Every structure is written in structure tokens, then in C-alpha cells.
Structure 1
């Protein structure tokens, strides 16, 4: 009787060893894991996790008595947390609020935020001021006619090689809450802008990826912007 029965969620995860430490000519080995209740939907594919769990057995119907191992997850720890819109947190504690309010009344606030932008880079003070302004951005407006005015600022740095523009891009990628650093032709296997590809096991259209979309609400640092 289904309208008087109670159910929980269960999820299959697939875990590989990290591709940095794999034998050169060998396939990276993987295990299936099962999680339930509040352990489901806690990690996205691609994240690096250490997981505590029971190493257990199932029989799948290659050897007279051969069993497939799996992991029953008891806990998941995320080593690094990816930056995205859904993963962004808007909650603040009162101590951080007080610290930011106390910071905002400093009369040399502009000077210290410009000095904090890439302290290892000699010169380019105007560029660092520009980078601070880019990090803040302007006010976005939505008007009664429906058309919107953007607040984001797009800055181009073009010049001779060896003038630390790539390091400025890297530091902006590090300091931004949401950021991606890509080339003009994209990444090694991550596209630029937006890619719509068919789903693997159900053959349905979905947004494959792309620098301009994963970095929504953030900064895309496009190195070698002329080749595109």
C-alpha cells in the first residue's frame, strides 16, 4: 500500500583515483559507492573527496567465485569546494559584518585595496585601480520597459610580453569569489562561452559547460584574447 509507505533517497557515486598519480600505461581504477538519507546530493561530479565507508561485496550476474567490491558511504569530506552560484553562501555572521563596516570607514581604503592587488607586481598602479573597480563592478539597473543596464566592467590589458598581465589575470582568478581563467580558444577540455551537448545515457540537450556561464556572477580572465 504505497500511500501508507515511507521512502528514502539512495544514490550511486563513482570514485576514481586521482589522475595525477596513475601508472603511465594503465587504466585508472574506480569503485562504486552507495549513499543514503542526508549523504545524497552532497557532492557534485568532479570534486575531490576523502570518504569513510564500509568496504563491502556484491555478486553480479570470469572466475568461479568472484565478487564486485563497493563502498557503503558513512561520511563525505570535501577537500576543496567549487565556486558557483548555488554553492555561494549569502549568510554572514555579526563579526564579519562588524569587521567590514569598520573597514569601510578607513579613509585610505582605496589605497589599501590597490596595494592588496598583486603586491608582487611592480608598477601598474592604474591597472590595479582598474582591477579593483572591475572586482566591485557597477550598479545594475532594471527599467520599467524591461531592458537592463549592466554593472559589470570589462577591462582589456594589451601590451608587450613579459609585463605581468597574465599574473594579474591569475591573481584576479585567485581573489574573485567566482572566477575562471581560460585562453581565447578555451581550455584543454573546457569550452569558452557556452556549450550545449547531448546527455550521455539519455541523449538529451543540456548545457555542457563554458567559461562565461560557470563564472556567472564572477570574472572570466581570458588570456590570449586575440586568438579566438
Structure 2
């Protein structure tokens, strides 16, 4: 799809991966491979010899399975883990400010103006639940619904068309 000509079909290639290359590819991904085309050990009615009709094949031994990569959370400083919150230098401030609520509210919708009531709520959805330690009574739940209704196109959809691009795993 980075090379989109007209006319012919999507010509298919055979292609191979080695062991440590295995199972870190996946459906739906664009790649940067090696080019180590090979001699591959009816209808080919050419001349025959001996002192045989081959097809084409291919292998490759390098992968950059990009456009499908985020990496979770790991100021180069000390913390619980390596880089999970190494920005203590500022997160200390981001947990002690008194106007942080509003400063957070207006930190994702500068290109938007409307009500200022779901700009303080909808962090709800991305925010945590409970994750507590209990017995085998039942599932205990952490996140919860939200709803929107509105008149025709007060930017009902641009709230969420972007939110998918905002956090990961949530298409």
C-alpha cells in the first residue's frame, strides 16, 4: 500500500522468518525486511537435462514491524521502577497543585469550546476504578458507562474521534 500501482493484481510473494523473528509479526502491519531471494529446492515444458521446473520463493531475516508499537510507561531520576514515573521532578507538582483540576480540564480541549461540565467529567472514563484485594465472592468492577445526547452537531463526534487517538488500546 506504500506502492499502489494500477493494472495488475496484488502479486503475492512467499516469505519466511527465522525463530526469534517468529510470532512478533501479526496481521495488519507494514514492514521493512531483508532481500535474500533464493533458489527454491507442471506447465514448464522447456528443455530438460541431466549429467526440473522451479517456481519462485523468498525468505528474509530482519523485521521492523512498525506502525503497531506504543510501549507502556518505562526526567531520568529514581522511582518505583525504571521509567514508570521518573518525572517525579514535575509529577510532585502535578499531584500537589490546588487548581490542577481546572488546569487539567483545559489541557486537552483548547481547540474546543462548549460546556465545561464533561471537560471535568470525561476524565472519569480514562481514570481508574478499584483494583482491590478480595476473596472469590465475585468480580468487582472498575470502570463505568457514560452517555451523550445533544442537538444536531454541537461537536458530538469530535469529542471521541480524537479520544481514540488519545489513549492506546482503545480503537
TM interval, short-chain normalised:
0.7 to 0.9
Normalization by structure 2: what TM-score? Answer: 0.73
Normalization by structure 1: what TM-score? Answer: 0.57
Q: Which of the two has higher C-alpha Rg? A: 2
Alpha-carbon RMSD across the aligned residues, in angstroms, is 2.9
* Displaced runs of 4 or more, over 3 A: 61-66, 88-92, 94-97, 99-102, 140-143
Task: State which of 43, 48, 70 in structure 1 corresponds to 2:30.
Answer: 48
Flag the 1:137–1:20 CA change in 2: closer, same or farther, 3 A: farther
Larger proportion of helix: 1
Flag the 1:124–1:48 CA change in 2: closer, same or farther, 3 A: farther
The alpha carbon displacement at 1:76 in A equals: 0.8
Distance in 1 (alpha carbons) for counterparts of 2:137 and 2:5: 54
1:177 — aligned with what?
168
Matches within 5 A, 1:78-117: 78-81=65-68, 89=72, 91=74, 92-93=82-83, 96-98=86-88, 99-117=90-108
**Number of aligned residues:** 156
1:31 — aligned with what?
13
Gaps (5+ residues) in structure 2? 47-52, 75-81
Gaps (5+ residues) in structure 1? 1-17, 181-228
Flag the 1:43–1:106 CA change in 2: closer, same or farther, 3 A: farther
1:77 — aligned with what?
64
Distance in 2 (alpha carbons) for counterparts of 1:175 and 1:27: 37
Flag the 1:70–1:110 CA change in 2: closer, same or farther, 3 A: same
